[PDB]
Design a binder for this molecule. Structure first.
Ligand code: K
Ligand code: MG
Lengths: 225, 215
RNA sequence: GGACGCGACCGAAAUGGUGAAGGACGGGUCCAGUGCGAAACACGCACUGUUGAGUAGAGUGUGAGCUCCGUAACUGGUCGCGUC
């Protein structure tokens, strides 16, 4: 029943602007306080802003005060976060949350949206180069061989990786991306497989980066001697 | 003065069945306006406790919250597999609201040494003037591990980046990739590329290496 | 002694005016806190406050009581006089 869907996220230059929306369903926002909380990647929850019912009073974290404006359109049952003068450090997943009913759950935020990613950067959208991580012309570490794909120099997040169109899932590890000093991301996905099948079993990494219309499949093979 | 919620510990390791306790300490009186949340990787937080000690509807009762003055505790009386997650306290006594730093609760298991693999850069990547050398530490526990890069036995510094996976849903281990980045010219000026791994499950450091332009 | 009558003085329900008293006269005065109304503030209600807290105003109460100055029903008292 109760649900919240944020939208509007995406990539924006520093000093730019972006409006997020938070579509409620299953309840009417007019009877609730609505909040925005954000999470920089790898970090914790940071409270951003809120709007109180009946008075329309609004409150803001110091770190965003003056730049961000929260608001509500009851007729669309939607709330908004107008972000202006954006800085790289506003890069975060943005969640809207409902503060629940006082008698039922005090001031706890009983429902949260799935979140929308806001990337603030002067880097421009770019698809990855995808390189093989070829299995060693040796034998073993553990008893098995390791191979993979290096997904290098894309922007912004995110990218998806799978192996053999989803059929190969066991022994897979897709690493969280690092932000390189160039301002581009890079990650690798690896899989351990038996070394006896390296010449006869086929291994393809499937990489999708939607923001740049880049979808690639890379066969990973042993090369020479 | 903004209100501080100081959360400890930042992480803890525990076995299924264990009783754990997580603490938030407020910098001034927040009455009982404290909530506790659970968050799993990639997912929105879920409300567990409100008003410091009230169980939120539908939350299993192994979760409890307690208030002692300005100190607040979330206790899980007996962890279950699905309880491994990060937990956040929040004060909503006054604005601005404040979240605690979080507490990652991870599962304990037997020490497992990593399997180490090194990968030279592809000739493909070499065509573009950058060489990426990758080292994989596979399926180990605990999480602490030390990776060092050597180029012709010289210790590298400042030119690598690591990344660690979330603890695995089946065997409870970690994997780690480290990437050494060089210009193609620098890369071609040397022979031996090595990755040296130090881990608790290793009696001695393990080195995996290759020689550039061989097999 | 008494009945009737007149008058004066006293008393006096009521009442006009007056001016001091601050939480032990109260309030729809004011402040803080807690709970409730789909409600943290603002709005409403309820509860709670150990110098809550300025005595007539932070009051647009012709508030109650009281101080002082009057008026006064009277179907209360006392004294004098008249008649018997
Ligand atoms: K008063
Ligand atoms: Mg109020």
């Amino acid at each position: 029943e109760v649900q919240l869907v944020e939208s509007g996220g995406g990539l924006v230059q520093p000093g730019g602007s972006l409006r997020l929306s938070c579509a409620a369903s299953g309840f009417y926002i007019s009877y609730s306080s609505i909040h925005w909380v954000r999470q920089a990647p790898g970090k914790g929850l940071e409270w951003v802003a809120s709007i109180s019912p009946y008075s329309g009073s609004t409150y803001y974290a110091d770190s965003v005060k003056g730049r961000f404006t929260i608001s509500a359109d009851t007729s669309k049952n939607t709330a908004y976060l107008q972000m202006n003068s954006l800085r790289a450090e506003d890069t975060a997943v943005y969640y809207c949350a409902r503060q629940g009913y006082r008698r039922r759950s005090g001031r706890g935020f009983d429902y949260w949206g799935q979140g929308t990613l806001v990337t603030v950067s002067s880097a421009s959208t770019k698809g990855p180069s995808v390189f093989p991580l070829a299995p060693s012309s040796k034998s073993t570490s553990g008893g098995t061989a390791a191979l993979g794909c290096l997904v290098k120099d894309y922007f912004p997040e995110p990218v998806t990786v799978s192996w053999n169109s989803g059929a190969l899932t066991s022994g897979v590890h897709t690493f969280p991306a690092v932000l390189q000093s160039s301002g581009l991301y890079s990650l690798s996905s690896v899989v351990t497989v038996p070394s006896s099948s390296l010449g006869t079993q086929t291994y393809i990494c499937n990489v999708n980066h939607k923001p740049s219309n880049t979808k690639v499949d890379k066969k990973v093979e042993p090369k020479s001697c | 003065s903004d209100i501080q919620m100081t959360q400890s510990p930042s992480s803890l390791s525990a076995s299924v069945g264990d009783r754990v306790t997580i603490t938030c300490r407020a910098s001034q009186s927040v009455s009982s306006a404290v909530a506790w949340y659970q968050q799993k990787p990639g997912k929105a937080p879920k409300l567990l406790i409100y008003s410091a000690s009230s169980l939120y509807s539908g939350v299993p009762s192994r979760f409890s919250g307690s208030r002692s003055g300005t100190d607040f505790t979330l206790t899980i009386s007996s962890l279950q597999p699905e309880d491994f997650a990060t937990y956040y306290c929040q004060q909503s006594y006054s604005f601005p609201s404040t979240f605690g730093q979080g507490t990652k609760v991870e599962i304990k298991r037997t020490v497992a040494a990593p399997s180490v693999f090194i990968f030279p850069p592809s000739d493909e990547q070499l065509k573009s003037g950058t060489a990426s050398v990758v080292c994989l530490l596979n399926n180990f526990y605990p999480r602490e591990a030390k990776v060092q890069w050597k180029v012709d036995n010289a210790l590298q510094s400042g030119n690598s980046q690591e990344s660690v996976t979330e603890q695995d849903s089946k065997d409870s281990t970690y994997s780690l990739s480290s990437t050494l980045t060089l210009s193609k010219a620098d890369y071609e000026k040397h022979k031996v590329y090595a990755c040296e791994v130090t881990h608790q499950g290793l009696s001695s450091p393990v080195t995996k290496s290759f020689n550039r332009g061989e097999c």
